[PDB]
Design a protein around this ligand. Structure first.
Ligand SMILES: COC(=O)[C@@]12OC[C@]34[C@H]([C@@H](O)[C@@H]1O)[C@@]1(C)CC(=O)C(O)=C(C)[C@@H]1C[C@H]3OC(=O)[C@H](OC(=O)/C=C(\C)C(C)C)[C@@H]24
Ligand SMILES: [Cl-]
Ligand SMILES: [Cl-]
Ligand SMILES: [Cl-]
Ligand SMILES: [Cl-]
Ligand SMILES: [Cl-]
Ligand SMILES: [Cl-]
Ligand SMILES: [Cl-]
Ligand SMILES: [K+]
Ligand SMILES: [Mg+2]
Ligand SMILES: [Mg+2]
Ligand SMILES: [Mg+2]
Ligand SMILES: [Mg+2]
Ligand SMILES: [Mg+2]
Ligand SMILES: [Mg+2]
Ligand SMILES: [Mg+2]
Ligand SMILES: [Mg+2]
Ligand SMILES: [Mg+2]
Ligand SMILES: [Mg+2]
Ligand SMILES: [Mg+2]
Ligand SMILES: [Mg+2]
Ligand SMILES: [Mg+2]
Ligand SMILES: [Mg+2]
Ligand SMILES: [Mg+2]
Ligand SMILES: [Mg+2]
Ligand SMILES: [Mg+2]
Ligand SMILES: [Mg+2]
Ligand SMILES: [Mg+2]
Ligand SMILES: [Mg+2]
Ligand SMILES: [Mg+2]
Ligand SMILES: [Mg+2]
Ligand code: NA
Ligand code: NA
Ligand code: NA
Ligand code: NA
Ligand code: NA
Ligand code: NA
Ligand code: NA
Ligand code: NA
Ligand code: NA
Ligand code: NA
Ligand code: NA
Ligand code: NA
Ligand code: NA
Ligand code: NA
Ligand code: NA
Ligand code: NA
Ligand code: NA
Ligand code: NA
Ligand code: NA
Ligand code: NA
Ligand code: NA
Ligand code: NA
Ligand code: NA
Ligand code: NA
Ligand code: NA
Ligand code: NA
Ligand SMILES: [Sr+2]
Ligand SMILES: [Sr+2]
Ligand SMILES: [Sr+2]
Ligand SMILES: [Sr+2]
Ligand SMILES: [Sr+2]
Ligand SMILES: [Sr+2]
Ligand SMILES: [Sr+2]
Ligand SMILES: [Sr+2]
Ligand SMILES: [Sr+2]
Ligand SMILES: [Sr+2]
Ligand SMILES: [Sr+2]
Ligand SMILES: [Sr+2]
Ligand SMILES: [Sr+2]
Ligand SMILES: [Sr+2]
Ligand SMILES: [Sr+2]
Ligand SMILES: [Sr+2]
Ligand SMILES: [Sr+2]
Ligand SMILES: [Sr+2]
Ligand SMILES: [Sr+2]
Ligand SMILES: [Sr+2]
Ligand SMILES: [Sr+2]
Ligand SMILES: [Sr+2]
Ligand SMILES: [Sr+2]
Ligand SMILES: [Sr+2]
Ligand SMILES: [Sr+2]
Ligand SMILES: [Sr+2]
Ligand SMILES: [Sr+2]
Ligand SMILES: [Sr+2]
Ligand SMILES: [Sr+2]
Lengths: 337, 172, 160, 142
RNA sequence: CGCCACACGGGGUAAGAGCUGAACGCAUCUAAGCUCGAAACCCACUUGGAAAAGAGACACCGCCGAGGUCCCGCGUACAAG
RNA sequence: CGAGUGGCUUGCUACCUCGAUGUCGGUUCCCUCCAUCCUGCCCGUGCAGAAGCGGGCAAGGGUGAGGUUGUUCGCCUAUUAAAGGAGGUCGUGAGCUGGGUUUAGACCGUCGUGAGACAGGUCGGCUGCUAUCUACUGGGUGUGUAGGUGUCUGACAAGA
RNA sequence: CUGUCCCAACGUUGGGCCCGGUGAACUGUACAUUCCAGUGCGGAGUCUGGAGACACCCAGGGGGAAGCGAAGACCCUAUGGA
RNA sequence: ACAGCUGGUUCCAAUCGAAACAUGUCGAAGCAUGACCUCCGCCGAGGUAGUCUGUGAGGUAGAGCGACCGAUUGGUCCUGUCAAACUCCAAACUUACAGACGCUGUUUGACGCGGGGAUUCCGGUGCGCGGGGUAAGCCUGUGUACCAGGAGGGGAACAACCCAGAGAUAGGUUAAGGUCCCCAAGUGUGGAUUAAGUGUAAUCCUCUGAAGGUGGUCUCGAGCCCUAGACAGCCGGGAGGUGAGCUUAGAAGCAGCUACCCUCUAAGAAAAGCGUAACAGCUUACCGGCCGAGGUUUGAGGCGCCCAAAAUGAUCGGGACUCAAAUCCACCACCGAGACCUGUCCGUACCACUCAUACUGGUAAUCGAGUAGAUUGG
């Protein structure tokens, strides 16, 4: 009666087309709980190494023992929160009201933006406060950029601009917290937002694989046995039945693979540090040497080396945080060999 | 049809739109009495439930509104009392009121506590093996009393052997 | 076979046994039930089962409805009780079946049916005043085994 | 943004189809109509069956598409479109000169059209468009 | 064939368990009202999405110049584009 | 005994196609139905419990690997939460396979005077075409909204 | 014994894709951006009702045009043939 | 080469206008002869598509069968059923002839006769009546109207369902059907019902919905009870002789058998239902009290509900509609054809005048669609 089988690939990451922004854009943000803070950071993918760890999990029979865990090294230098955008609750959803900028800008920010010369931070701040009094204020987010110049292995000097939310206390107290970060110079580090041992969500634009067939793209079978020698090797059986007399968008077809935005959930931050502790002998292949602020993410992270990855506190964690894991050993062995 | 209900001396009731608020010494109850062409009003010191229609459906609700108002009169004066008894066979059940919710622990040997939230101004008092649910709103009290009995529901095994659970003893 | 094939009056009156051979015997065991020695006018109550639609009822449906009606009266009033039921309709209409495609389609004889018009009495029971609700229940079981909807009409009884 | 309406209609406690039928007739006669308070617009009947019909319209679709609005903003706009020959030149002009709104973006209170109002004191079996939208999964922003 | 990640929880229901309750003084889970209750529905989460013709919003830069294209060295990209 | 629903079986009819709408089985890939095999929530019990039997809501997901046979069907084995059924031109040959049916060669049995036949069996026995339109998967160029850079919104859309 | 399979991967050579040059054919009543239902000689891009749909171009695998190819060998019929 | 087989056969207009049937046929994919269409000549006064009446023919529907015939019940006359190949009866209706009225014909020559030319002999659908068949958009009859060969209007689309038979152009009024929007015309009036989105679906392959069930709701009738207090609820009483007798270890209202009696009283069973080993225990009958107005039994009708499961996207055409934009009973005003009325023109036929078939005048309510085909002017 022909065996049942789940369909080839998922329909939830559709359409499988090229990403608009190489800079990932979060579609969801964490809940407002504790003290006001920026709900995310960003860095550049470096490569991989392994780390030996002491089991933190209280429910594991191996609690206290040495365990080898794979890790993705990401260079995370300080970022600059250059502005504060405010949204207002309109009957058509959330719309941007005004932005509060600065005077202090990074030397090479003019490679992406038409940097402000004449702005009134006080009139903008006043507009946001009248909206708060009116009860029309939505959420408060910061316009943030990265400093790729701080990373020697990344060729680009052109900053990657992205918006990040500020959640936490009351809308009055976090407006103030946001303005204080901006009005200084906008400088903040990974430490300011994340603590080692917490679960983060990493968003990234995947490795570009160009155009690939159904077998690679959707995981369909190759033609088996005798069918494999007739002139058809990696082409599906049919594009659909007689009726409906059309090809459904659900049938596995050829096209763009990779260079899509993915948001990898519940990624444990093994260690946040600075220096050259995670650097590989001979340098990370197709990247370079690490000597500065870094993060160690448990397992894999979307995108290739040199790509901008984004961080966010886990919106849906399964486990309770087990802060600052005991790092007994970090490998520095050559990735070549 | 028209049914006039004389308000007791202990009671005084105000009304706005379709909502009727009934105040007394034991508390206050606000209810919404809404049905087609049935007008409920306060005429000095009487509550008047009237309609121009005399059909079975309209008549059913006039009679329901009457009993709802008479029950509110009794609630704000003498109140509503539901008595319950906690019975157990092998496992010592621990019934306790923790905040605005009544919690039943170690039911039938369970490690996980069974709990239900108390409906409004309803007060649940415990004296050892007896539980007494009380308050002005019969809707709230009747349900909170029911919620406690329903909380020890057992669908998996025979009810005749596994009889553990709080049951309603006194109905008002 | 279903009654859908034989319930309506569409074919001509086919009853002439001098031209029809191989007709199956009637499944109807009795026509006069109860106390067949006593008269109909000796009973105060006379209740009949009236057929509402013009139909053709097979001998098997006639037997099933009669058997489930009289069996209730044998149960409630006794085997030799004070009642008498009568099935006034007899299965005259001979039925065929084409059981070869549509060539030489005239069918072979498979059974018999009774032509009952709308408003007619199929069953008629004569009982006493105390046994009136037992016969109305015997007909409630009897009408469930025939094709049309029915009326349980009391023709001689102002005792209500 | 500003919309110079000749007629501003208040949909509050008014039977949707009856308002829509009149708003269509007026749009074809060259009027610039604006329906206001559509979240509070009404449609009579058993809620359970009304929601079923509207939920089916959301579940209906293919690759060609059957875009069905979940917000009361668009539901009323689609109801007006069904009473207009929107595919023809004359009918499109009429439709584009009609706009439905959540609440009242104007200063003026809208007018209640004749035969459209529903007496809440005489009816129990009805639904508000906002209630339909909340069940359909739309984000309450009114 | 290796390694990492992929909840819970809310909201409304079905079958069902009930509360208050009348027509029908009683009784009644229902007729009005209400508390619950499915891997199902909606939200939550991920992906796409200004061509949404109501064709959107904000900030800054610029209209004799902001910005872009061609060119040149190259890939985190790529069948042409 | 009576009343029906379906259009999965078979049969009937001869409306459609004989200037050809490619066969059965299988395969691959996609959507669906519920009359539900499992999974969730339930009611009853000849419900102590455990394991069951019967029923209700429910189509989200799952329903797999193998031995004989071309088989569909079915029989059988070991696993399994369960290894449900059905529709899509008995879905699917400008996708595959070609084992069966059904050409030309040959044998056997049966029938026939014979040529030769068989709703018997058996061995062998071919699979065309550079996509105009439409459809969908992905990729670009323009026009509309009416100078630019950067950041967003979210009508709707997909998901297991 | 083994990639026939579990279950697919990487590589090699020629194509395929872009550029110069050369340069056919099949096919074409018309119109033609379709989709879901319906209707109709009962198997519709064109009829009816709705839904959707800005134009053009590149690559693709072939769902539909009961696609293209052959006045069906099957079956019946002809006071046809061998 | 022949073919009874497929394909094709080239300009305009005017008049009439079929047959898809019968008989024969190596005939059934074809012919011939008839039916029927057309054209020509002849004849010379009647004709008969309708109706009424008179004089005749008839055994189908229905009915009935101690009226024949043959089926087909039971009881100790009575009692129960039937018939295509039964009939003591018996229509509606069809039909012969005649008179009357109507219509028609005697310049438009009818009725009839003679001759030339055909086409045609695959039909289909609706309705009525059928016969076969489970049925069928089945097969095969018959009468009739239609499609074929019939436009236009309506019915969502749609040969045959509704209106309507149609020269050109024009004004007007209607028909079927429709008047909330899409869409011309009512968000018309008086009143009632329905809460299911039932329904908004004349007919139908197409629009399903059945047997059965329904304190959903509306309406009408009948019997009985009731302020001497009904129906229900709640309280109180529910007593003694005696735990009846028999049976039995026992049975005491209540295992079984028979009887089922009388005191007290306002009631209270030789006990209606549970309950116990048997008692006890709980109520039932029955009486009283509180309360206070209708209650109870049964019959009929209206609308709705359950019964009610299918495959890419749900549907009355769609939107959508609830004192309706549904349903039923009435009513009012409108929209809406090429129909009908009306102005002008055209063709054709006929009349007057004429050599004319040239002009001119006149008549057509009783002329104007048409496939095959006959005829005629260009
Ligand atoms: C290209 O072929 C076709 O189109 C056919 O369509 C399906 C079909 C036919 C025909 O419809 C038609 O001629 C049937 C569907 C017709 C039918 O009636 C019948 O019973 C069968 C058995 C057919 C199946 C199939 O058969 C072919 O031989 C027949 O195929 C052939 O006749 C011939 C083919 C493929 C070539 C040799 C010309 C099919
Ligand atoms: Cl294969
Ligand atoms: Cl869609
Ligand atoms: Cl239109
Ligand atoms: Cl209502
Ligand atoms: Cl005519
Ligand atoms: Cl609806
Ligand atoms: Cl001429
Ligand atoms: K064919
Ligand atoms: Mg390596
Ligand atoms: Mg190594
Ligand atoms: Mg058990
Ligand atoms: Mg084909
Ligand atoms: Mg079911
Ligand atoms: Mg599914
Ligand atoms: Mg195998
Ligand atoms: Mg097939
Ligand atoms: Mg195909
Ligand atoms: Mg092929
Ligand atoms: Mg090919
Ligand atoms: Mg073989
Ligand atoms: Mg073979
Ligand atoms: Mg041929
Ligand atoms: Mg042959
Ligand atoms: Mg020969
Ligand atoms: Mg001509
Ligand atoms: Mg002429
Ligand atoms: Mg007769
Ligand atoms: Mg013809
Ligand atoms: Mg109008
Ligand atoms: Mg309906
Ligand atoms: Na090949
Ligand atoms: Na095919
Ligand atoms: Na035969
Ligand atoms: Na409605
Ligand atoms: Na939709
Ligand atoms: Na829930
Ligand atoms: Na059926
Ligand atoms: Na069939
Ligand atoms: Na196949
Ligand atoms: Na399922
Ligand atoms: Na097998
Ligand atoms: Na086919
Ligand atoms: Na095949
Ligand atoms: Na092939
Ligand atoms: Na290989
Ligand atoms: Na194709
Ligand atoms: Na010949
Ligand atoms: Na003929
Ligand atoms: Na012949
Ligand atoms: Na012939
Ligand atoms: Na005459
Ligand atoms: Na008759
Ligand atoms: Na005609
Ligand atoms: Na029409
Ligand atoms: Na409906
Ligand atoms: Na002609
Ligand atoms: Sr973002
Ligand atoms: Sr989003
Ligand atoms: Sr091959
Ligand atoms: Sr199709
Ligand atoms: Sr018949
Ligand atoms: Sr019946
Ligand atoms: Sr319920
Ligand atoms: Sr735009
Ligand atoms: Sr189950
Ligand atoms: Sr094998
Ligand atoms: Sr088969
Ligand atoms: Sr077999
Ligand atoms: Sr299949
Ligand atoms: Sr073969
Ligand atoms: Sr075989
Ligand atoms: Sr054979
Ligand atoms: Sr334009
Ligand atoms: Sr169309
Ligand atoms: Sr190709
Ligand atoms: Sr006759
Ligand atoms: Sr109007
Ligand atoms: Sr009206
Ligand atoms: Sr009315
Ligand atoms: Sr059809
Ligand atoms: Sr019908
Ligand atoms: Sr019924
Ligand atoms: Sr179902
Ligand atoms: Sr003419
Ligand atoms: Sr003519």
């Amino acid at each position: 009666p022909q065996p049942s089988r789940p369909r080839k690939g998922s329909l939830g990451f559709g359409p499988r087309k090229r990403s608009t922004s190489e800079t990932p854009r979060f579609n969801s943000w964490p809940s407002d709980d504790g003290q006001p803070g920026v709900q995310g950071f960003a860095g550049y993918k470096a490569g991989m190494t392994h780390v030996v760890l002491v089991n933190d999990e209280p429910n594991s029979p191996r609690e206290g023992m040495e365990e080898t865990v794979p890790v993705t090294v990401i260079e995370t230098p300080p970022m600059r929160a250059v502005a504060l955008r405010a949204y207002e609750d309109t009957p058509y959803g959330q719309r941007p009201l005004t932005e509060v900028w600065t005077d202090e800008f990074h030397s090479e920010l003019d490679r992406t933006l038409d940097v402000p010369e004449d702005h009134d931070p006080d009139a903008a701040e006043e507009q946001i406060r009248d909206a708060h009094e009116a009860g029309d204020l939505g959420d408060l987010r910061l316009i943030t950029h990265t400093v790729p110049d701080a990373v020697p292995s990344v060729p680009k000097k052109k900053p990657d601009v992205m918006e990040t939310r500020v959640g936490g206390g009351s809308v009055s107290d976090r407006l103030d917290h946001a303005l204080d970060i901006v009005e200084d110079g906008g400088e903040h580090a990974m430490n300011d937002i994340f603590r080692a041992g917490e679960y983060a969500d990493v968003a990234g634009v995947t490795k570009g694989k160009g155009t690939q067939g159904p077998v690679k793209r959707w995981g369909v079978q190759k033609r088996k046995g005798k069918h494999a020698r007739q002139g058809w090797r990696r082409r599906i059986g049919n594009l659909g039945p007689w009726n409906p007399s059309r090809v459904r968008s659900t049938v596995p077809q050829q096209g763009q693979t990779g260079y899509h935005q993915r948001t990898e959930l519940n990624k444990r931050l093994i260690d946040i540090g600075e220096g050259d502790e995670p650097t590989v002998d001979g340098g990370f292949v197709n990247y370079g040497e690490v000597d500065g602020p870094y993060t160690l993410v448990k397992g894999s992270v979307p995108g290739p080396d040199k790509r901008l990855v984004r961080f966010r506190p886990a919106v849906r964690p399964n486990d309770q945080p087990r802060l600052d894991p005991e790092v007994r050993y970090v490998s520095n062995e050559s990735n070549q060999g | 049809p028209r049914v006039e209900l004389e308000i007791p001396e202990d009671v005084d009731a105000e009304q706005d739109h379709l909502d009727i608020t009934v105040e007394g010494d034991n508390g206050s109850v606000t209810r919404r009495l809404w049905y087609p062409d049935i007008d409920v009003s306060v005429d000095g010191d009487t509550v008047v439930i009237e309609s121009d229609e005399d059909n079975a459906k309209t008549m059913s609700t006039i009679g329901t509104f009457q009993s709802h108002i008479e029950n509110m009169f009794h609630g704000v004066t003498e109140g509503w009392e539901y008595g319950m008894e906690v019975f157990y066979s092998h496992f010592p059940m621990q019934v306790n009121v923790e905040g605005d919710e009544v919690v039943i622990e170690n039911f039938l040997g369970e490690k996980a506590p069974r709990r239900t939230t108390i409906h409004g101004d309803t007060d649940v008092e415990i004296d050892g093996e007896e539980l007494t649910v009380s308050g002005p709103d019969i809707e709230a009290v009747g349900q909170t009393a029911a919620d406690i009995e329903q909380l020890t529901r057992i669908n998996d095994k025979d009810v005749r052997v596994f009889q553990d659970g709080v049951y309603i003893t006194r109905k008002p | 076979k279903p009654a859908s094939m034989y319930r309506d009056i569409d074919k001509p009156a086919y009853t002439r046994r001098e031209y029809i051979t191989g007709i199956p015997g009637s499944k109807i065991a009795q026509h006069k039930m109860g106390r067949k020695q006593k008269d109909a006018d000796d009973y105060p109550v006379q209740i009949s089962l009236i057929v509402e639609e013009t139909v053709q009822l097979r001998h098997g449906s006639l037997e099933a409805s009669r058997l489930s009606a009289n069996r209730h009266l044998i149960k409630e009033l006794g085997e030799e009780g004070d009642y008498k039921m009568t099935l006034r309709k007899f299965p005259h209409q001979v039925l065929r079946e084409n059981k070869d495609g549509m060539r030489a389609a005239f069918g072979k004889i498979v059974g018999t049916a009774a032509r009952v018009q709308a408003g007619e009495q199929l069953f008629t029971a004569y009982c006493n005043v105390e046994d009136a609700e037992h016969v109305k229940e015997a007909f409630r079981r009897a009408y469930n085994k025939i094709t049309p909807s029915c009326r349980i009409k009391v023709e001689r009884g102002e005792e209500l | 943004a500003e919309f110079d309406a000749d007629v501003i209609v208040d949909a509050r406690d008014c039977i949707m189809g009856r308002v829509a039928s009149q708003v269509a007739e007026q749009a074809l006669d060259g009027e610039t109509v604006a329906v206001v308070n559509a979240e509070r617009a009404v449609i009579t009947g058993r809620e359970e069956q009304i929601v079923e019909k509207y939920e089916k319209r959301v579940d209906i679709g293919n690759d060609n598409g059957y875009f069905y609005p979940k917000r009361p903003d668009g539901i009323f706009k689609r109801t007006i479109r069904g009473m207009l020959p929107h595919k023809k030149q004359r009918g499109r002009e009429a439709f584009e000169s009609v706009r439905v709104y959540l609440g009242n973006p104007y200063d003026e209170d809208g007018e209640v059209l004749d035969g459209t109002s529903l007496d809440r004191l005489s009816n129990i079996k009805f639904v508000t468009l906002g209630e339909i939208s909340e069940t359909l999964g739309a984000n309450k922003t009114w």
